[PDB]
């Protein structure tokens, strides 16, 4: 009602940007609250919420209101570097002043702002932000998008022993990454929505800084510095990724990650634009990739690899293979095959932390 605060432009940008990251008019506004030397900014879409806290040095008066998120961030971003932003509520209008720049913004009541219903935390732990970035980055691309099986439109976050694991799949390809966090955790597995995975990923630009994760039965929370990101969990049953992992992949191929990637990228040019099918013929220390399309054009690549198994032929969607080779970012890659109708496990030749399983196409 009588809300007032004066703060630097640089202390407001990232807090505003992260929170601002509509259907109902109030979802397009940010809830601002001043209380006990702290400005709290809150954004929400009803499924997830981002809360940012900014400490107030200069004099202030408590109160609360909601203001357009995008316009208020654009105002603060547009002001010169080092600017002092004086904010105050004047009736039903929030005034923003800085130098000789004055902005009168419209408001909606703070009482009308939606809040996520309270919950109790079951699992809790801390880890570096780079470990969480690596876990998400390594499996993000394998999540499904707008799949009828709603539980696949997200990432499985799983704790076991002293490891945090992320799993993502769309029924055709799967990605699993495990990282040790050095703390004894309970056996818990939850599905974070793909919108939440993106928001959680967009706020991890502090490398070794810590991140505290609190998981509940229907919610997950992430504390990065002065931010608090909370998201509802997907209420479904994730498939048993252990069942579909290749059991006995006897045939082992080893090749250069880049040379294999550039060969698949070149063969992909003349593959079917809708089905993206490539044929892999593997033989003693050799891999022949072939691609055909309805225009009767053909691409063919022969590479020197390390392979001592039996000769076999197998089909694959070249985009799924390239996505795995782009994600690995290593010197040498290992493909572990079984037969022409079973999946392949692709890993880095020097690391077992991240594994990828791709189901083939019938050739």
């Amino acid at each position: 009602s009588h809300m007032k605060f004066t703060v630097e432009r640089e202390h407001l940008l990232k807090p505003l940007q992260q929170v601002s990251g509509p259907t109902l008019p109030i979802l397009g506004n940010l809830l601002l609250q001043v209380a006990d030397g702290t400005l709290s900014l809150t954004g929400t879409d009803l499924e997830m919420e981002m809360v940012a806290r900014v400490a107030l040095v200069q004099p202030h008066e408590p109160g609360a209101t909601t203001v357009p998120a995008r316009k208020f961030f654009d105002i603060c971003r547009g002001l010169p570097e080092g600017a002092e932003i004086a904010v105050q509520l004047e009736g039903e209008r929030m005034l923003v002043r800085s130098g000789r720049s004055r902005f009168s913004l419209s408001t909606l009541p703070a009482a009308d702002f939606p809040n996520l219903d309270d919950w109790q935390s079951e699992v809790e732990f801390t880890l570096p932000q780079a470990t969480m970035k690596r876990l998400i980055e390594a499996t993000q691309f394998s999540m499904a998008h707008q799949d009828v099986r709603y539980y696949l439109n997200g990432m499985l976050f799983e704790t076991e022993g002293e490891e945090l694991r992320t799993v993502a799949t769309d029924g055709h390809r799967l990605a699993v990454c495990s990282m040790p966090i050095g703390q004894s955790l309970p056996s818990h597995s939850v599905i974070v929505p793909r919108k939440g995975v993106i928001e959680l990923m967009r706020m991890l630009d502090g490398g070794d800084n810590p991140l505290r994760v609190q998981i509940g039965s229907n919610n997950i929370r992430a504390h990065v510095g002065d931010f608090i990101f909370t998201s509802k969990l997907v209420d479904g049953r994730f498939p048993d990724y252990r069942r579909v992992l290749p059991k006995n992949p006897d045939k082992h191929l080893e090749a250069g990650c880049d040379l294999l990637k550039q060969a698949f990228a070149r063969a992909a040019i003349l593959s079917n634009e809708k089905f993206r099918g490539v044929r892999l013929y593997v033989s003693e220390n050799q891999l022949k990739i072939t691609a055909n399309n309805p225009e009767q054009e053909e691409a063919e690549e022969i590479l020197d690899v390390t392979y001592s198994g039996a000769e076999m032929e197998i089909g694959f969607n070249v985009s799924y293979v390239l996505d795995v080779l782009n994600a690995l970012k290593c010197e040498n890659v290992r493909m572990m095959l079984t037969d022409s109708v079973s999946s392949v496990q692709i890993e880095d030749a020097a690391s077992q932390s991240a594994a990828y399983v791709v189901m083939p196409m019938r050739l």
């Binding site: 029924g171 055709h172 069942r243 999946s343 399983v357 189901m359 083939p360 196409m361």
Partner: peptide, 5 residues
Amino acid sequence: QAXLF
């Protein structure tokens, strides 16, 4: 394309 399950 063959499904994993």
